Amino acid sequence: MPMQMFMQVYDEIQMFLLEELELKFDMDPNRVRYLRKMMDTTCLGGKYNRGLTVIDVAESLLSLSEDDGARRKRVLHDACVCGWMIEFLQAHYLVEDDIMDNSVTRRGKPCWYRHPDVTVQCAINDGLLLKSWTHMMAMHFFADRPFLQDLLCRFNRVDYTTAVGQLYDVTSMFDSNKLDPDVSQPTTTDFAEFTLSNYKRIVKYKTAYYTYLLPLVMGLIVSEALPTVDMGVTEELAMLMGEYFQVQDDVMDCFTPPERLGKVGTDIQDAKCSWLAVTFLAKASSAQVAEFKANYGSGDSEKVATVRRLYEEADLQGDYVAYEAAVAEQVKELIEKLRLCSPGFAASVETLWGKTYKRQK
Amino acid sequence: MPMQMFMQVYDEIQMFLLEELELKFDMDPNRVRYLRKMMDTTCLGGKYNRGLTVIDVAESLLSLSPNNNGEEDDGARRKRVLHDACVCGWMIEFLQAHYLVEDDIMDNSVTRRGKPCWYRHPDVTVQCAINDGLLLKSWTHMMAMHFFADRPFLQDLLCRFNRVDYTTAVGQLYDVTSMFDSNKLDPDVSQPTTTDFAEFTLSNYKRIVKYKTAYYTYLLPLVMGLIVSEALPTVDMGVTEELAMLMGEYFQVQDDVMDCFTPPERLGKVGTDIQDAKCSWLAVTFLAKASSAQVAEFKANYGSGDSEKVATVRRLYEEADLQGDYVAYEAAVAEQVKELIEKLRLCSPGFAASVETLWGKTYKRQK
Numbered sequence A: 001m002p003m004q005m006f007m008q009v010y011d012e013i014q015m016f017l018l019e020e021l022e023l024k025f026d027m028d029p030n031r032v033r034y035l036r037k038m039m040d041t042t043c044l045g046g047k048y049n050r051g052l053t054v055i056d057v058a059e060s061l062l063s064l065s066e067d068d069g070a071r072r073k074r075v076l077h078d079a080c081v082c083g084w085m086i087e088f089l090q091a092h093y094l095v096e097d098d099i100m101d102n103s104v105t106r107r108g109k110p111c112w113y114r115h116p117d118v119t120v121q122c123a124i125n126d127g128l129l130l131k132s133w134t135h136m137m138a139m140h141f142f143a144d145r146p147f148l149q150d151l152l153c154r155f156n157r158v159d160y161t162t163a164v165g166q167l168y169d170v171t172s173m174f175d176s177n178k179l180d181p182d183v184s185q186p187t188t189t190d191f192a193e194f195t196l197s198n199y200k201r202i203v204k205y206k207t208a209y210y211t212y213l214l215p216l217v218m219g220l221i222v223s224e225a226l227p228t229v230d231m232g233v234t235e236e237l238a239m240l241m242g243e244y245f246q247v248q249d250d251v252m253d254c255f256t257p258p259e260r261l262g263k264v265g266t267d268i269q270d271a272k273c274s275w276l277a278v279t280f281l282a283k284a285s286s287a288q289v290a291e292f293k294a295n296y297g298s299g300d301s302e303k304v305a306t307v308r309r310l311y312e313e314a315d316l317q318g319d320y321v322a323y324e325a326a327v328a329e330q331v332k333e334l335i336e337k338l339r340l341c342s343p344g345f346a347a348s349v350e351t352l353w354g355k356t357y358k359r360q361k
Numbered sequence B: 001m002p003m004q005m006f007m008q009v010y011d012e013i014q015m016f017l018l019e020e021l022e023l024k025f026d027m028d029p030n031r032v033r034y035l036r037k038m039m040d041t042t043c044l045g046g047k048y049n050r051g052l053t054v055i056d057v058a059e060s061l062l063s064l065s066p067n068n069n070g071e072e073d074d075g076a077r078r079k080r081v082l083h084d085a086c087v088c089g090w091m092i093e094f095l096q097a098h099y100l101v102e103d104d105i106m107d108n109s110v111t112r113r114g115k116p117c118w119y120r121h122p123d124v125t126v127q128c129a130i131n132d133g134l135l136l137k138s139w140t141h142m143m144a145m146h147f148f149a150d151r152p153f154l155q156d157l158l159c160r161f162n163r164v165d166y167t168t169a170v171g172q173l174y175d176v177t178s179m180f181d182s183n184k185l186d187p188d189v190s191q192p193t194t195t196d197f198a199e200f201t202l203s204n205y206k207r208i209v210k211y212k213t214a215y216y217t218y219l220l221p222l223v224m225g226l227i228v229s230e231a232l233p234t235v236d237m238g239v240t241e242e243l244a245m246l247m248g249e250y251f252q253v254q255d256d257v258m259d260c261f262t263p264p265e266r267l268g269k270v271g272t273d274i275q276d277a278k279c280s281w282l283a284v285t286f287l288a289k290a291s292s293a294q295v296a297e298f299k300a301n302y303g304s305g306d307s308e309k310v311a312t313v314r315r316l317y318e319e320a321d322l323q324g325d326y327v328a329y330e331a332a333v334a335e336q337v338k339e340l341i342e343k344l345r346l347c348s349p350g351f352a353a354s355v356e357t358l359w360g361k362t363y364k365r366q367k
Ligand SMILES: O=P(O)(O)C(CNc1ccccn1)P(=O)(O)O
Pocket: A093, A094, A097, A098, A101, A103, A162, A165, A166, A169, A206, A207
């Protein structure tokens, strides 16, 4: 049912974008060919839990003041459009992050930039095009909406918020004291920034805002129910669900089959600042830490293998399971807080939690 | 003075953006320092010609054709407009600084404004540079929300602005897909450099230049000056857009030649264009009037890293007398421009004047 309309609205959005480029931007059928494949490829093949959340949250707040059925159709189309704004935003960040991250695969398919006819110079701009599309579809559908001003101001703040996250992520293997663009870039070996604290900060901004906070806020917005909700609890949940999601990402990076996964994991190889990495270095012995230091951040045979055994060596899977129960409990008390006043809303956040909490296939 | 105030608005913008990172985003002094250095480097260095135009359009519209509704000529609305005009000006420069960061990387340039491209700096990584670029465009949205928060024009401001940000990205699409044949444009397929340069035609030059240069360089400054002036509807947009497309094309044409002919030293960078086999005005004008033989040679050189093969390509330009083609091109433009400006005077003379000043800073170009 939801996938039904959503995908309808996709076709709607896409028709509008491609057709506008033809009339007003003097584009040839070819470049319009390119751009529709770019869009489909970069914006499709996911489980769309971010756009979808918007629709559910919207529907669940649809009765906050016998009826019509027209309001219903209006709010739920608005919710599909914001939903796709979120998915195009992500698509933008993903295309730019595979380029930044030198990844090779995404979702079973090669990254956009690693497409036979995609050059990275064009890929880079293709990412910008996706972002531009979110503003284009926003003005096209919500020009006459009283909420437009506040929709885009919040949307743009999470855009920004996500870019800051990305600067956090990408400046984490280095000594922040030595973060001066005039000198060279020697990746740390003390791993003194492989901290849980520092971990938490990159993941909150890079992940939690656009993945958990934005779908909910947009959902509220197109439902004219935003102030109906304790933003404090709401923000708490999102920040938390979002930390947990990434940690889930972190572990799946390391121990989930790349076939299963859809991309041979690199984190260890690219020496990222994952949950495993910072959780390991904190509980780890002197010997274990010398050993980690000697087989981290290198594309090897026995090495990554080394770094993978060390993590089981340290029972990171038990630390994890303890994490999840901790998180699962704070999420439960937060949701009941919301339920008091916003029952319908705490219902959709429950539904959100349920697509997070498991997170398996 | 106009750069006095412009520049103290920069300091203003940078303090809010930077203070807001540390305050609302948990940023540490280390990364605030980086981000301040990044902003200065990518944003300060040029001549703020699109930035200061907005200031010019705005002063010349509180004077001639201004708001009658606006108090009996008393100084308070002017420093407010002007201050707005400065934010708008830095919005345009931050938007440009965004596209130049990504562009130097895309185009793989080595230097800009007499210096290593951002992505070319020592403690700047290519993956960080890309994201830095993105922050640049975000900052445009954060400075506008912060200063124009209560401003009635903020939506109109923001709509037009993103429209132009978008027409520029499309322009970048047109420029980078220039080298190969549109027909064989299929991401699922490897691709070869066009060897026949068959899309190196004027019509496509015109296109991948009008969208990529003239809108944000000429239309946006003028449009934003109108808006913070609240004098938007007082002008013929169509004729206004006409000359900004006019002016933009010439600017770009005039920049294509500086590229291949102005010394790297004097051009504040090293001309990639021939090396990178770009679709300059120069190439499209050569291929269109050249013999079969002159053309065979262009192919046997163009788009080759070199001192001597990049110099043969630069020879047939002289031999093909591109140098007089330009002169003639420039003259047809200066007169076509000249005309539209007069049509603008008939209702919007204050406006029409600021456009002469902008035109006069284009024509009179040796930078
Ligand atoms: O780079 P990672 O590891 O954080 C992740 C991409 N997630 C992103 C990427 C860009 C902006 C925000 N979140 P992915 O490439 O594993 O999907």
